[PDB]
Amino acid sequence: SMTEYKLVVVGAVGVGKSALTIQLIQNHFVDEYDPTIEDSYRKQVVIDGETCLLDILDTAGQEEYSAMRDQYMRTGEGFLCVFAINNTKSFEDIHHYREQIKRVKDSEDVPMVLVGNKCDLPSRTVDTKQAQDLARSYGIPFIETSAKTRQGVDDAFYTLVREIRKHK
Amino acid sequence: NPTVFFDIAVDGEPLGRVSFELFADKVPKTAENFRALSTGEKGFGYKGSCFHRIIPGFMCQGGDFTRHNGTGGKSIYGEKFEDENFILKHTGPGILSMANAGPNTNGSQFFICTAKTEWLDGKHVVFGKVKEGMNIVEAMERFGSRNGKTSKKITIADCGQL
Ligand SMILES: CCn1c(-c2cccnc2[C@H](C)OC)c2c3cc(ccc31)-c1csc(n1)C[C@H](NC(=O)[C@H]1C[C@@H]1C)C(=O)N1CCC[C@H](N1)C(=O)OCC(C)(C)C2
Ligand SMILES: Nc1nc2c(ncn2[C@@H]2O[C@H](COP(=O)(O)OP(=O)(O)NP(=O)(O)O)[C@@H](O)[C@H]2O)c(=O)[nH]1
Ligand SMILES: [Mg+2]
């Protein structure tokens, strides 16, 4: 049977966690905002010649439940850390999620990918260079995406699988 | 204080009637929104809409009659209206309270608590409580799940003012 990868998508409310995941799984985008409680998805893919199963946990951004993330962080193998390039606050919130994952897993070596979503939008407030520098400071890849145009969507998830692969 | 009712159906099969007291004496604008939406008198309202999020141990949420998918809803004052006050608390099962997407975004979505939900105090406007039919709300719970997706369509087949 094929290797399964437990991916978790995290980030502030409205950054595009669900829109990214539903583009991956269903190949469609809607501008409507349906706030997530918690959703799980499965998808078979081929990455660098190798077939595998993505088990994706799409989490809630709600800060009021920030104390209920520990179990899914323990269980997850890799994390897609999403902010929106037109929302400076979501970029600040990113540092918090990374520190929280590191603390909960008790490791400096957690597979993750920094994702700057909504790159189709003109109202950009977070510079490409800002995110590359943060990613570099973390030792993780940075990918620009648009759930709306599909730019970078596969690449973001597939890169995260590569990060998990190198860790194992 | 006005009283309204919902006749609940499950996949079109009748379940029973839930009635609510609306605290017009304490939150008149929010009570009036819910009353008017229950009668349909503005030309739109709850009749036919579903409970799209049911989480046993917590609440039953509904009221999206514009998009029928959990994302919509509108008030009788415009798409959204401000938080009237936070005088009343989420004290236990039966409390009726407005759903929202942050401060001052009340539309038509609402929830009925099936337990005390105190951490929602000061964030969601409480404006009513179940008067009769709490056993109908309790019976709705088994059609829900941990993340709230329902296993049968739970609809407001009819509603009005008593
Ligand atoms: C961390 C997990 N988690 C929990 C929780 C906490 C502790 C233990 N277990 C859980 C669940 C079962 O673990 C999977 C919650 C919860 C709530 C949210 C996101 C995640 C949540 C969430 C997303 S958006 C919102 N909260 C407010 C939401 N807004 C909209 O729907 C806007 C569209 C319309 C206009 C809204 O007003 N309500 C009306 C009040 C109840 C509220 N929904 C809701 O569903 O609470 C679910 C509840 C009660 C279980 C809390
Ligand atoms: N233009 C544009 N809009 C996007 C993009 N990704 C998401 N959105 C929009 O942003 C809003 C929120 O997206 P959503 O995926 O629900 O965000 P979330 O991070 O899942 N939110 P939550 O934590 O509450 O579940 C929606 O209106 C959605 O259409 C994107 O790449 N471009
Ligand atoms: Mg989401």
**Cβ atoms within 10 Å, residue A63:** 11
CB B1 within 8 A of CB B99: no
CA distances B145 to A39, A114, B29, B55, B142, Å, are 12, 32, 33, 5, 8
CATH number, residue A64:
3.40.50.300
d(CA B96, CA B100) in angstroms, rounded, equals 13
Q: Which residues line ligand 1 (CB under 6 A)?
A: A 35, 37-38, 60, 62, 65, 68; B 53, 55, 58-59, 61, 99-101, 109, 111, 117, 120, 124, 146-148
**Residue A36: closest C-alpha in chain B:** B147
Q: Are B69 and A32 within 8 A, CB to CB?
A: yes
Instruction: Quote the ligand 1 centre to B63 CA distance (angstroms).
Output: 15
Give the CA diameter of chain A.
45
Taking an 8 Å cut-off on Cβ atoms, the answer to whether B69 and A39 are in contact is no
> At CA B114, angle to CA A73 and CA B156, rounded to 5?
110
Among A42, A72, A40, residue whose Cα is nearest residue A54: A42
What is the spatial order of strands in the sheet that A50-59 belongs to?
A38-47, A50-59, A3-11, A78-84, A112-117, A142-144
Report the relative pairing of strands A50-59 and A3-11 from DSSP bridges.
Answer: parallel
Give how far A45 is from chain B: nearest CA, Å: 26
Domain count, chain A: 1
Residue of A nearest to B119 (CA): A64
Domains annotated on chain B, with CATH:
3-162 (2.40.100.10)
Query: How many helices (H) and strands (E) in chain B?
Result: 2, 8
- Report how far residue A80's alpha carbon sits from residue A16's, in angstroms, rounded to the nearest whole number: 11
- What's the CA gap between A43 and B68, in Å, rounded? 27
Instruction: Assess contact for A81 and A90: CB atoms under 8 A.
Output: no
Q: Is B44 a catalytic residue?
A: no
Contact B67, A32 (CB under 8 A): yes
Residues near A108 by beta carbon (within 8 Å), at least 6 away in sequence? A102
As given in the structure block, the two tokens for residue B3 are 């009283």
CA of B118 from ligand 1 middle (Å) equals: 13
Among this protein's residues, is B161 annotated catalytic? no
Question: Mutation test of ligand 2: which of A26, A32, A36, A59 has the most ligand atoms closer than 8 Å to its C-beta?
Answer: A36
Least Cα distance to B22 among B45, B46, B3 occurs for B3
Please list, residue by residue across B93-108, b when 16 or more beta carbons sit within 10 angstroms of its beta carbon and e when fewer do. Answer: bbbbbbbbeeeebbbb
CA of A12 to the centre of ligand 3 (A): 9
Resolution in A for the shown PDB structure? 1.6
- What's the rounded Cα separation, in Å, for the pair A160 and A141? 8
Residue A39 belongs to domain spanning: 3-166
Tokens 């296993």 found at? B151
Q: Write out the E strands in chain A.
A: 3-11, 38-47, 50-59, 78-84, 112-117, 142-144
Please state whether beta strands A38-47 and A3-11 pair in parallel, antiparallel, or not at all (unpaired). Answer: unpaired
A79 backbone dihedrals φ, ψ, rounded to 5°: -125, 130
CA distance B27 to B123: 15
Which residues neighbour B55 within 8 Å (Cβ) at sequence distance 6 or greater? Answer: A37, B144, B145, B146, B147, B148
Radius of gyration of chain A (CA): 15
Rounded to 5 degrees, φ, ψ at A42 are: -130, 140
Q: Which residue has the tokens 């145009």?
A: A149
Helix A88-105 vs helix A128-138: angle between axes, to the nearest 10 degrees? 10
